[PDB]
Amino acid sequence: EVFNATRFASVYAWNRKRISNCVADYSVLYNSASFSTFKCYGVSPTKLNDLCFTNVYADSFVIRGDEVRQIAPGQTGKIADYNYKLPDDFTGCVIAWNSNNLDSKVGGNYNYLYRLFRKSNLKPFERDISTEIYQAGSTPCNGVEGFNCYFPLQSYGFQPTNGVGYQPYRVVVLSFELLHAPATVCGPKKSTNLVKNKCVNFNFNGLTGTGVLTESNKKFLPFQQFGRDIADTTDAVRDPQT
Amino acid sequence: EVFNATRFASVYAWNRKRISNCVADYSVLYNSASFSTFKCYGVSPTKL
Amino acid sequence: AYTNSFTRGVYYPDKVFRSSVLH
Amino acid sequence: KNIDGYFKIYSKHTPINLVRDLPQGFSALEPLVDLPIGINITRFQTLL
Amino acid sequence: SNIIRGWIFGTTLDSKTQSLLIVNNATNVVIKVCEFQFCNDPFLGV
Amino acid sequence: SNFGAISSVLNDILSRLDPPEAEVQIDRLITGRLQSLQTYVTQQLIRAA
Amino acid sequence: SAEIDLGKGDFREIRASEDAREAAEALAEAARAMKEALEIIREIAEKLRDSSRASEAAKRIAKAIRKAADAIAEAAKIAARAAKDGDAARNAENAARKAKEFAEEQAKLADMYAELAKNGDKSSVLEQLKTFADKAFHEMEDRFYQAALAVFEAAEAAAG
Numbered sequence: 001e002v003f004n005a006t007r008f009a010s011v012y013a014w015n016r017k018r019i020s021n022c023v024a025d026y027s028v029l030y031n032s033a034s035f036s037t038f039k040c041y042g043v044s045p046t047k048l049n050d051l052c053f054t055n056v057y058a059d060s061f062v063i064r065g066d067e068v069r070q071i072a073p074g075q076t077g078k079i080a081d082y083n084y085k086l087p088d089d090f091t092g093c094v095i096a097w098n099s100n101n102l103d104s105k106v107g108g109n110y111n112y113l114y115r116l117f118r119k120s121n122l123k124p125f126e127r128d129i130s131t132e133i134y135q136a137g138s139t140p141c142n143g144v145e146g147f148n149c150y151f152p153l154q155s156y157g158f159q160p161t162n163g164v165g166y167q168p169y170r171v172v173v174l175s176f177e178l179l180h181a182p183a184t185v186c187g188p189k190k191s192t193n194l195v196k197n198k199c200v201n202f203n204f205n206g207l208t209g210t211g212v213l214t215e216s217n218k219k220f221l222p223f224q225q226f227g228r229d230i231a232d233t234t235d236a237v238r239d240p241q242t
Numbered sequence: 243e244v245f246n247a248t249r250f251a252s253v254y255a256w257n258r259k260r261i262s263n264c265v266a267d268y269s270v271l272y273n274s275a276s277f278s279t280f281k282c283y284g285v286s287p288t289k290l
Numbered sequence: 291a292y293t294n295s296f297t298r299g300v301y302y303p304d305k306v307f308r309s310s311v312l313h
Numbered sequence: 314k315n316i317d318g319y320f321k322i323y324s325k326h327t328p329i330n331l332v333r334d335l336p337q338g339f340s341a342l343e344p345l346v347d348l349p350i351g352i353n354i355t356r357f358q359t360l361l
Numbered sequence: 362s363n364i365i366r367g368w369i370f371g372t373t374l375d376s377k378t379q380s381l382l383i384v385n386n387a388t389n390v391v392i393k394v395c396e397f398q399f400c401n402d403p404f405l406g407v
Numbered sequence: 408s409n410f411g412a413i414s415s416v417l418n419d420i421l422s423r424l425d426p427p428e429a430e431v432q433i434d435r436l437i438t439g440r441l442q443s444l445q446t447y448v449t450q451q452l453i454r455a456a
Numbered sequence: 457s458a459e460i461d462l463g464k465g466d467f468r469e470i471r472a473s474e475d476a477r478e479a480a481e482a483l484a485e486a487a488r489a490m491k492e493a494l495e496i497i498r499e500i501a502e503k504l505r506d507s508s509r510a511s512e513a514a515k516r517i518a519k520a521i522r523k524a525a526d527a528i529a530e531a532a533k534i535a536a537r538a539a540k541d542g543d544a545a546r547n548a549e550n551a552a553r554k555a556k557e558f559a560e561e562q563a564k565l566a567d568m569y570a571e572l573a574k575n576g577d578k579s580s581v582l583e584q585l586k587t588f589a590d591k592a593f594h595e596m597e598d599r600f601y602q603a604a605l606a607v608f609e610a611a612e613a614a615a616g
């Protein structure tokens with residue numbers, strides 16, 4: 001839904017739409033060249049179909065051309081400083097593609113707001129949405145937006161014939177929460193099957209590998225996913241059906 | 243030699259005086275408003 | 291009113307089971 | 314507690330056998346929800 | 362008596378910044394994060 | 408241990424990342440284990456002696 | 457036949473007779489003036505390091521601002537002098553007006569920071585010289601591309 005989608009927000013504020021119950025493939029994607037740049041960090045594309053999924057989150061917003069590179073880990077820059085901070089780990093995909101047939105108003109697309117001033121260069125995934133004058137410098141700036149102080153957020157005014165360096169892109173970013181819990185958004189498989197006492201490679205959503213599987217004489221906590229060996233290997237799992 | 247001295251020349255005949263290694267101690271200059279400007283360019287008043 | 295919190299407060303670090311192993 | 318924009322809550326239920334004390338026993342604490350909410354927390358109060 | 366049945370969190374707590382609180386009914390947990398405008402001192406019914 | 412690499416579950420590396428990316432990642436991990444193993448051996452071999 | 461990259465990095469090579477150029481020579485000035493005036497402004501907001509140089513800075517910008525302002529003001533009137541198009545002429549003027557207004561309202565406000573920039577007390581003034589500069593930077597260029605457009609849009613009027 002959110003890709004062939006209607007209306008997208010700013011960058012300092014956005015719409016984390018947690019998604020559940022899905023069977024996502026993402027191979028409906030990374031084959032539609034309508035994605036401009038698609039660079040992934042925790043996972044490589046065409047591989048994010050296998051087992052790596054527990055309540056991922058989405059991120060929709062809009063920005064002009066050059067700004068896409070700023071969104072990677074690190075990559076310091078105004079949008080990444082006061083407007084949208086990306087952590088240094090587990091970052092998943094980054095979808096960038098053109099937002100020009102829905103944007104770039106004739107006189108300018110005046111409705112895309114970036115925080116021009118803010119102390120404390122953004123914390124990871126921080127949403128500072130409130131718009132108070134910066135109070136910059138030793139000065140009263142108290143509803144006055146006066147000297148040394150003015151509106152924290154500004155527009156871009158993209159034009160329908162605007163420049164490619166500033167042609168505006170609609171950017172999607174997917175976070176990925178790994179393995180902690182019952183999974184939710186798997187990749188097509190099921191094998192409808194389960195067998196014991198036989199060397200078989202396994203993919204019980206929480207790991208891959210090969211072994212011999214027995215109904216175990218040990219009790220777990222209900223919420224609790226699965227054990228682990230002192231060897232930091234999978235002691236046992238809970239079959240999500242059985 | 244440039245402040246406590248006695249005699250000066252004209253302005254177009256400004257006498258050049260280069261001072262090499264010693265301690266300047268602009269503090270006795272700073273803690274004294276004997277001047278009109280004390281105006282600084284490129285480097286601020288006392289930070290020099 | 292100040293009392294001494296002796297040893298309460300230990301909470302599960304995460305949702306990964308372990309068995310009879312110090313950690 | 315809050316780390317990396319989340320929020321975590323834990324629970325336990327042992328009986329009460331004191332009036333003006335706090336039990337000098339121990340029981341573990343178990344996860345409740347890994348609340349993923351983008352807020353800063355510095356002040357907090359209870360509800361009676 | 363479940364006398365204590367809810368929490369509060371946040372930074373400015375009166376819609377000046379995003380706020381957080383939770384309320385515990387008799388049987389079904391109730392929570393939200395909003396633009397809260399708190400009562401200066403909490404209470405509840407009976 | 409993870410030796411800088413993102414997980415000691417080398418299968419995750421064998422699963423999540425792509426082999427061109429994996430090589431760099433897997434290279435870090437194997438180094439440390441290979442480093443550890445020989446350390447154990449020397450530890451053994453002297454102890455044997 | 458003009459090698460010009462209008463505001464927001466759009467390159468336009470006309471195909472007409474001279475009178476377009478003799479309508480866009482001021483654009484060949486103003487657009488030339490525009491980035492060059494701004495190419496320092498992008499520099500100043502982040503290279504600002506010295507207490508007194510702020511006086512030189514905020515004076516330079518307002519000084520460099522108006523080199524755009526007059527040119528962008530006249531980039532259009534010479535473009536609308538051959539106006540077969542009232543839209544292009546009006547858009548020439550409107551863009552000339554507003555952007556030059558932006559180039560002749562903020563320019564004096566640029567002097568307003570040049571006021572304390574004379575002493576340049578390194579406490580906070582260099583901080584506030586930084587402040588409006590970007591605010592200036594972003595605001596000016598956008599008004600100036602549409603300025604850089606309507607003028608050639610006016611040069612397109614008597615382009616054939």
Ligand SMILES: *[C@@H]1O[C@H](CO)[C@@H](O)[C@H](O)[C@H]1NC(C)=O
Pocket residue numbers: 384385386387388389390391
């Ligand atoms: C649970 O709390 C909600 C919110 O206050 C309330 O609407 C509902 O009636 C409560 N239910 C019970 C069983 O207490």
